[PDB]
Design a binder for this molecule. Structure first.
Ligand SMILES: NC(=O)c1ccc[n+]([C@@H]2O[C@H](COP(=O)([O-])OP(=O)(O)OC[C@H]3O[C@@H](n4cnc5c(N)ncnc54)[C@H](O)[C@@H]3O)[C@@H](O)[C@H]2O)c1
Ligand SMILES: NC(=O)c1ccc[n+]([C@@H]2O[C@H](COP(=O)([O-])OP(=O)(O)OC[C@H]3O[C@@H](n4cnc5c(N)ncnc54)[C@H](O)[C@@H]3O)[C@@H](O)[C@H]2O)c1
Lengths: 338, 338
């Protein structure tokens, strides 16, 4: 309708992170949920006075549900979608889309057949400062992008096989895909794994070659020592102030975009443009609803049939990059992208 | 003597940058100079009431000169040293040492034969904060270095074959060589060249593999838009406060050193240690004499026969890395190092 009857599949962390968006946004009503855990079902049914179910089989059979936000573990993503599609439901699934490229192909096909929209869940490439930055790149005001440099140093690895590559490199790659705006053509990466305790790849650095000359360097460190939010005006990833409650925009650490005539540096509270004149802080409005840019995508895809940017085909390319990384670090070698 | 009779070959920029050190440091007396340009000679002779000369042939023949700070263009470095050595003078030559590896080999040999010290001039790897950081790594307090991430965004390219690689990547490589402390084994680099006006390689990003696992990412951008000193407590490269008074230490932009149990972040005014419990800012003393760490190296090499760290064999390895970079960017393949 005017308002959008939304069903949630998977009632954990992704869900709770997404939760204050869903309430606050006038265009969204939560109408139904599913989870295997009944205490979650008990939970949801109570707060929302709404039907709950064991499987997605339940939620997708409910005629009152217009689209399903799939917010469960990665390995269920593909199957869950294939079903929601079967029953004519729009899908918003969380990063990563899926673990495999095949999975992705199927997901996009199952959705194309059922003729329903497929969007990928809060990616940080949705955040206003970045979208605002891409606008500046779009305008051609600073000429084209030549070099992107992005870092993030977080406590993720200690927040209470790939791990950081698939969850965290995704956000990072998606922002750089967003901002450069051309295709990724080659990737070269090093992962670090140096805590026995938490024996996963906890940091990386990578080089990306882009179509038409631009290149990018991405570095992630998750071992929770240095906190890169110091260089983002002491605003946390979810918009809250960490400085030593009207939140700010979301981000994924320090990014610098170098274009021919200038440097763009998006912030949670503004976008700085370093130019031929000099410094410009063009400030941003305090987001009224957190992560509302995700809803707009969904809302306008379903109500007004507008191609969403962050569709299944986009997400698939980011994943492609994620795999290429882990292959580069995995072997000794570069990975060209066909 | 107690004091050190020093002769200067080449009286331009490097010289003037080094000049307030030379005056202020009690252990150094300027006694002689040479330059081809007589207005420079006129200049030096007047301020310092001292003998000046056309060639280094002159300065090296002066019996009163104990060592020569060679601060001329790169292509003269080798020859000038060969001579100063021939005449038994110690050499402090400016980055880069030389242009070629052969040149380097000869320089070190000419100096080993004449049995005189050879040190490479103000490298930023001399700066207190970095030396202090290496101390922390030395102590083993944080376990070994795993990943180094270093960036610098400057106005160098517009300050009134590959210019930034040899001048600027040198400082950067030297700091990372300093701090990791093991051998560089492989390099992969991308340079950008995007101003027709100033058609040089003005930016790069690189991956460095080190002996025994650690890796590093270095990024330089010289096109003078964004200023990375924002993230160094708004203190300039030569210690002056940018912001909105005795100087502070020298630096070369934001560096983060990740060791197994924590992250070290050197600053011009302190060294931050992030580890278990909290932030630690261990502060530093305001340098009494700018770049005094260069003099100590020289002074202790000549008076007290202490092996200098930044010797000709060190500088040669940095240059080796610098060449490897320009080869990687040049060919788009990796470069292993022997
Ligand atoms: N971009 C973001 O904001 C963000 C946040 C965190 C994680 N994520 C994504 O969200 C996903 C889920 O959130 P989370 O894992 O952080 O929290 P979580 O593991 O606590 O929540 C997921 C829950 O979904 C339930 N679930 C629903 N349908 C299921 C099914 N068919 N099979 C099994 N379990 C099912 C499970 O009970 C599980 O506990 C992650 O796998 C990841 O893809 C992205
Ligand atoms: N780390 C640092 O502080 C720093 C600073 C700037 C540049 N550098 C190094 O300093 C070197 C020289 O300083 P600069 O180039 O910035 O200033 P510059 O070019 O104005 O000064 C060098 C001067 O040396 C004189 N000279 C002396 N002997 C000479 C000879 N035999 N042939 C020709 N000229 C001779 C020339 O007159 C020349 O002008 C550079 O090549 C570079 O290696 C490093």
């Amino acid at each position: 309708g005017h308002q959008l009857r939304l069903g949630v599949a998977g009632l954990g962390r992704a869900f709770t992170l997404m939760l204050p968006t869903l309430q606050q946004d006038p265009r969204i009503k939560l109408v139904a949920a599913c989870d295997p855990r009944g205490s979650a079902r008990a939970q949801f049914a109570s707060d929302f006075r709404a039907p709950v179910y064991p499987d997605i089989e339940g939620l997708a059979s409910n005629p009152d549900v217009e689209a399903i936000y799939i917010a469960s573990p990665h390995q269920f993503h593909a199957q869950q979608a294939r079903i929601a599609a079967r029953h004519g439901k729009h899908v918003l699934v969380e990063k990563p889309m899926a673990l495999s490229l095949g999975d992705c192909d199927e997901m996009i096909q199952h959705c194309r057949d059922a003729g329903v929209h497929l969007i990928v869940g809060h990616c940080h490439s949705f955040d206003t400062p970045y979208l605002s930055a891409r606008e500046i790149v779009q305008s051609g005001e600073l000429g084209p992008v030549r070099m992107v440099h992005a870092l993030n140093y977080t406590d993720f690895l200690y927040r209470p096989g790939g791990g950081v590559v698939f969850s965290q490199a995704a956000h990072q790659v998606d922002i750089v895909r967003l901002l450069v705006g051309t295709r990724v053509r080659r990737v070269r990466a090093i992962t670090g794994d140096w805590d026995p305790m938490r024996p996963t790849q906890g940091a990386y650095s990578a080089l990306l070659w882009f179509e038409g000359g631009a290149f990018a360097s991405i570095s992630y460190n998750g071992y929770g020592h240095f906190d890169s939010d110091e260089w983002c005006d002491w605003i946390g990833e979810m918009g809250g102030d960490k400085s030593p409650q009207p939140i700010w925009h979301q981000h994924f650490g320090p990014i610098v975009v170098s274009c021919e005539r200038g440097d763009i540096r998006p912030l949670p509270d503004s976008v700085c443009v370093y130019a031929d004149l000099a410094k410009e802080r063009r400030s941003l409005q305090r987001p009224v609803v957190p992560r509302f840019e995700v809803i707009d995508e969904l809302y306008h895809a379903v109500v007004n049939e507008i191609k969403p940017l962050h569709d299944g085909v986009w997400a698939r390319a980011t994943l492609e990059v994620c795999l290429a990384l882990l292959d580069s670090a995995g072997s000794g070698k570069d990975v060209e992208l066909p």
